[PDB]
């Protein structure tokens, strides 16, 4: 059920991926703080994948307490031909946040399963 978008030294990003229609996937993204210091000012940015409309809802909050599992949730959907076909859809994403006297960034492009 939970797939791992990304796992750094501080933050795990994972998600539930259901299929809601023949053209639409629904992602329920979860953010986990796996470190001993709080994370603040968290935000995910995302690009529309190549053959698809991306719909992003606002996240539950922008703060994760130390060792907080799923302290923020954010719903996205992906809709279009690629999902209808079995075409691999790539999410280009970037996160920014603050922890440990530091302003951090994390980025990638992950092929959704």
Swiss-Prot record:
It is found in: Golgi apparatus, trans-Golgi network. One of its GO terms (cellular component) is cytosol. Residues 1-113 form the GAE domain. Coiled coil: none annotated. The keyword Phosphoprotein applies. GO terms for biological process: Golgi to endosome transport; Golgi to vacuole transport; protein transport to vacuole involved in ubiquitin-dependent protein catabolic process via the multivesicular body sorting pathway. GO terms for molecular function: phosphatidylinositol binding; ubiquitin binding. It comes from the Eukaryota. Its main location: Golgi. Keywords: Coiled coil, Golgi apparatus, Phosphoprotein, Protein transport, Transport. The keyword Coiled coil applies. Present with 656 molecules/cell in log phase SD medium. Binds to ARF1 and ARF2. May play a role in the regulation of membrane traffic through the trans-Golgi network. This is ADP-ribosylation factor-binding protein GGA1. The gene is GGA1.
């Amino acid at each position: 059920q939970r797939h791992i978008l990304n796992q750094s030294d501080h933050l795990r990003i994972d998600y539930e991926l259901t299929r809601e229609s023949m053209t639409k996937l629904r992602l329920v993204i979860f953010y986990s703080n796996i470190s001993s210091d709080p994370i603040t000012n968290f935000a995910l940015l995302v690009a529309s994948p190549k053959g698809t409309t991306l719909s992003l809802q606002p996240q539950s909050g922008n703060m994760l307490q130390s060792n907080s599992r799923d302290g923020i949730k954010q719903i996205a959907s992906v809709e279009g031909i690629s999902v209808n076909l079995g075409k691999p859809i790539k999410l280009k994403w970037k996160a920014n946040y603050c922890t440990k006297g530091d302003s951090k960034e994390e980025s990638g492009t992950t092929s959704l399963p």
